[PDB]
Amino acid sequence: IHTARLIHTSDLDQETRDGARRMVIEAFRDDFTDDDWDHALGGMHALISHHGALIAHGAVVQRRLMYRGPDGRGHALRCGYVEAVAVREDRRGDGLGTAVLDALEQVIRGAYQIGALSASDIARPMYIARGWLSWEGPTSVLTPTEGIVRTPEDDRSLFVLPVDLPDGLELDTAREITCDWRSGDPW
Amino acid sequence: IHTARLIHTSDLDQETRDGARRMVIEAFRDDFTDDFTDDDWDHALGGMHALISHHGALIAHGAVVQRRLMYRGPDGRGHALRCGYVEAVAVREDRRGDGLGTAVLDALEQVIRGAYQIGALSASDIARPMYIARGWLSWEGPTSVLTPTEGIVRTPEDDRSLFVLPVDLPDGLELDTAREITCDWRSGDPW
Ligand SMILES: CC(C)(COP(=O)(O)OP(=O)(O)OC[C@H]1O[C@@H](n2cnc3c(N)ncnc32)[C@H](O)[C@@H]1OP(=O)(O)O)[C@@H](O)C(=O)NCCC(=O)NCCS
Ligand SMILES: CC(C)(COP(=O)(O)OP(=O)(O)OC[C@H]1O[C@@H](n2cnc3c(N)ncnc32)[C@H](O)[C@@H]1OP(=O)(O)O)[C@@H](O)C(=O)NCCC(=O)NCCS
Ligand SMILES: CC(C)(COP(=O)(O)OP(=O)(O)OC[C@H]1O[C@@H](n2cnc3c(N)ncnc32)[C@H](O)[C@@H]1OP(=O)(O)O)[C@@H](O)C(=O)NCCC(=O)NCCS
Ligand SMILES: NC[C@@H]1O[C@H](O[C@H]2[C@@H](O)[C@H](O[C@@H]3[C@@H](O)[C@H](N)C[C@H](N)[C@H]3O[C@H]3O[C@H](CN)[C@@H](O)[C@H](O)[C@H]3N)O[C@@H]2CO)[C@H](N)[C@@H](O)[C@@H]1O
Ligand SMILES: NC[C@@H]1O[C@H](O[C@H]2[C@@H](O)[C@H](O[C@@H]3[C@@H](O)[C@H](N)C[C@H](N)[C@H]3O[C@H]3O[C@H](CN)[C@@H](O)[C@H](O)[C@H]3N)O[C@@H]2CO)[C@H](N)[C@@H](O)[C@@H]1O
């Protein structure tokens, strides 16, 4: 069985960051943009290498997810957001994806109030099987110039993993949920 | 001689985390209202901690957490910068003045330079000369916060407290510190 190493972005040399980026881009090839890479930087990376070649990657970066309960109170949850999860093609189906998520979920459970991610279609059963909840209500992003704006192309994609919500808060996945602002894909 | 260890929030046991919080709360003491509040501790969670311990006792702490800083340049183009935000920098009172806080900020600035486009913090009044000497820039224009119900809302209590450390600004961006700057939303003190 393989085990992922967990490394902060700042503990990654440029050679190893460039190798990770190139492995991720190839893994997403039919798609992975310059903004997509920026989104994967700043947090903890899960890495698996074999003889100096990276064969699996994932990242969890901190952001705020905003949720307003029925009673009208607002919540700005410390969110561990999962990005750039990828296994080299020739090494897929061997549990390397599971090893990446095991290490990232340890980060989420140890440090954040909620995990969240916008899953590709292929990865959906994988996350469902691990206990991630599909979000059923509308999604949105908090923009700097127009307030909260709907993001309908992301409604089907969003999964959350509530690990340490504030005392008495219970997420209703049919309500709206809002992510903080960034360039490119908000979710 | 003094070197802090870097550890992510998720690698601290609850007892070390709780000790860190108690130590930082006391460091911020000069009645029953703690100057360093529960929300203040939450803002230190989720990133990299710099720790210094001496025969088991935690004698220094600092953290850098990821946020977005929003800045609109003089050309009208908006930027959502990946920001390493510095929180809860503290040295046990009896050990101050020996380079421990310098050692904490050394480690945190390494995180910022290696991971983020910009470092930022909201400095206590008395700590401002220290940050200037380390090459942080004082922000001179108005500060604000992007709220989910109101618009961008001015935060005048934090004007003149903000410092930034621009380590990897995109392509041609050059910060003009007289313009407005805006932080993302969180509970408690936004800056
Ligand atoms: C997504 C990706 C990382 C999965 O990697 P992988 O090596 O195929 O995955 P694994 O072999 O580790 O399988 C992961 C888990 O999903 C499970 N699984 C896969 N398909 C499943 C299905 N239809 N139903 C139930 N479980 C399923 C496996 O059983 C495994 O769980 P297990 O370890 O308990 O058995 C890989 O396909 C990839 O890199 N794709 C390209 C990039 C991409 O699209 N990334 C997803 C963005 S979130
Ligand atoms: C502010 C603090 C972290 C500085 O740590 P320190 O270990 O005492 O300071 P250092 O010895 O590393 O010196 C760093 C700089 O701090 C300044 N400073 C602040 N308090 C100082 C003190 N008691 N003794 C010496 N320098 C002090 C000096 O300008 C010094 O610069 P220098 O070495 O070039 O002379 C620490 O005194 C403390 O915990 N105070 C409580 C308040 C606080 O931390 N504010 C939050 C940061 S915004
Ligand atoms: C730290 C600095 C002063 C050089 O280091 P240094 O002068 O050798 O300082 P040290 O590391 O030896 O500090 C230890 C000494 O601090 C003194 N000291 C400072 N605070 C003390 C305290 N609270 N208790 C006891 N001694 C203290 C003591 O004399 C101690 O020596 P001793 O106990 O052995 O007698 C350095 O940061 C510097 O030169 N600062 C430049 C200023 C700057 O950055 N400004 C730029 C303007 S933009
Ligand atoms: N875009 C068209 C389709 O893209 C697919 O790839 C999938 C994937 O990239 C993408 O997945 C989702 C989208 O769902 C969702 N609307 C936004 C979200 N940020 C994105 O996210 C995913 O891909 C990004 C790269 N982008 C990565 O940066 C990100 O970490 C990853 N989780 O959408 C696709 C499936 O939903 C295939 N290439 C092909 O089946 C088809 O062409
Ligand atoms: N009065 C002198 C000193 O005051 C300190 O209090 C200062 C401190 O709380 C606070 O400092 C600044 C403010 O400026 C600024 N407008 C907002 C910013 N979030 C805050 O931040 C600072 O204190 C917080 C705890 N709150 C920490 O969580 C935070 O990491 C720290 N950088 O404002 C106070 C005055 O600057 C301490 N009580 C003690 O170190 C000493 O007594």
Swiss-Prot record, chain B:
It holds the Pfam family Acetyltransf_1. NCBIfam families: AAC_2p_Id. The lineage of its organism: Bacteria, Bacillati, Actinomycetota, Actinomycetes, Mycobacteriales. GO terms for biological process: response to antibiotic. Substrate binds at residues 35, 87-88, 122, 157-158. It is an enzyme of class 2 (transferase). Catalyzes the coenzyme A-dependent acetylation of the 2' hydroxyl or amino group of a broad spectrum of aminoglycosides. It confers resistance to aminoglycosides. The keyword Transferase applies. GO terms for molecular function: acyltransferase activity, transferring groups other than amino-acyl groups. It comes from Mycolicibacterium smegmatis (strain ATCC 700084 / mc(2)155). This is Aminoglycoside 2'-N-acetyltransferase. Gene3D superfamilies: 3.40.630.30. Residues 7-170 form the N-acetyltransferase domain. Keywords: Acyltransferase, Antibiotic resistance, Transferase. Coiled coil: none annotated. CoA binds at residues 89-91, 96-101. Its EC number is 2.3.1.-. The keyword Transferase applies. InterPro entries: Acyl_CoA_acyltransferase, GNAT_dom. Homodimer. It comes from the Bacteria. Belongs to the AAC(2')-I acetyltransferase family.
